[PDB]
Protein: fatty acyl CoA synthetase FADD13 (FATTY-ACYL-CoA SYNTHETASE)
Organism: Mycobacterium tuberculosis
Amino acid sequence: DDKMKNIGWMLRQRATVSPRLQAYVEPSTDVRMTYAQMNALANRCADVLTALGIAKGDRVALLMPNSVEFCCLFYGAAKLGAVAVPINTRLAAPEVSFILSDSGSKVVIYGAPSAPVIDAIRAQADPPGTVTDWIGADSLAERLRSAAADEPAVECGGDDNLFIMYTSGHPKGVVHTHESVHSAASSWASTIDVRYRDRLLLPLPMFHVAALTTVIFSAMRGVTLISMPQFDATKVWSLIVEERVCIGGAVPAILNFMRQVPEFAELDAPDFRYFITGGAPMPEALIKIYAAKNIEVVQGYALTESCGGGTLLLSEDALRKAGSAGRATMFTDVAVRGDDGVIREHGEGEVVIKSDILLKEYWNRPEATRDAFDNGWFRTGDIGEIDDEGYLYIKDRLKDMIISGGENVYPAEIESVIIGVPGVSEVAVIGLPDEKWGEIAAAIVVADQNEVSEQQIVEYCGTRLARYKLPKKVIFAEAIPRNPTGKILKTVLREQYSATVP
Ligand SMILES: N[C@@H](Cc1c[nH]c[nH+]1)C(=O)O
């Protein structure tokens, strides 16, 4: 009986071990709920979904702000064997319409901030045809008020589908199961220093895979979620103090802003131990200033396809291994697949993952699914290097890969050669559109133009790189666009140089 492997039943079990432990605290909306209350609201959510015709395998799209309803809808769907489709509320109406059609969502639950997108979608001549119900905030709240908190007969779990999350032309839907979600939650919970009764600040959207995994591992470990649905750097330290927060989810921008507000210098947070951050590596200067406040930083690497698991750079290693994405986590194997097709745990190549945290499939894309795997190893499309001690360094992401005359070219391959040229101080490589090649690799170079010439860089590149990998344009710039935490902004580069191509 797969109920024992059901994420919604897991919540019920946390509500049995620790019924009176705080589960969800959102001071902005005055929500302070125990695990027993959260389980009861999940049951009410399940009752509401049942009432709407949702059965095992049916998709319920979620387009709403962070809230305990978001969590309990997810849990409620889990108990029913339904499949949640959490949608990014920043997407425009055509992208949301695609997702609804592709997922074949039956019910759409939307927040008030998303009413304009839903309105635009429902106004189409032929809206997504599978949607039988569009349920906004007021309707959901009224339904919840009259629902019974009966525990559903839960008879699904394990490898049963649980959610579809879209990742990007058109996105693909990444299908996760009760098993993958549980594995990812276990992976985090067994790898990071998380403790029974820890209080964890979530100030990132719940439609991001890592935030979803955070919600689930919180129930798994008995952690209280402290919710900040709209991040405000001028309000976050107060919240961290008032709610005795132990761990916080963040990204480097957030931690940078949090360092600049008056509260950083002024409030003391003795219970706060570390942030878990996603995104580019944290700058050393930021790691150090947080370390002076006795706060550590955990970093890592994950994808939608890995349910937010993958590698973690533990606190002890943040400075030691600046720029690393860390080591493989519990329940995850991570390696690199060479140009030769050999998978190795040490060296350079395409990052590959083998783990129960992996997606079951891309939704209604069986060939894409097969092509993404090599003997159980998921091919990320990202390139990196694993050092002799097992630390992963990401070199380039799939999103920045260039297809030039049908050949794949990653920018880091070129950047790491050109940065070597004497007189070059910085280099970033992007693809620019091209009638002939589709995209060409353009090197944007900051250099002493008295010492360095375009011809010299290209003829120098011709020394280390196959001919098809040579930059087809070299562009000298006085500056490359970077964010305050020092990440090269390739999206800005592409915008800047759109004026140079037809
Ligand atoms: N080994 C089970 C454990 C589990 C899943 N969900 C809740 N518990 C699985 O991952 O499928």
Notes: Residues 5-7, 10, 157-158, 178-179, 182-183 surround histidine (CB under 6 Å).
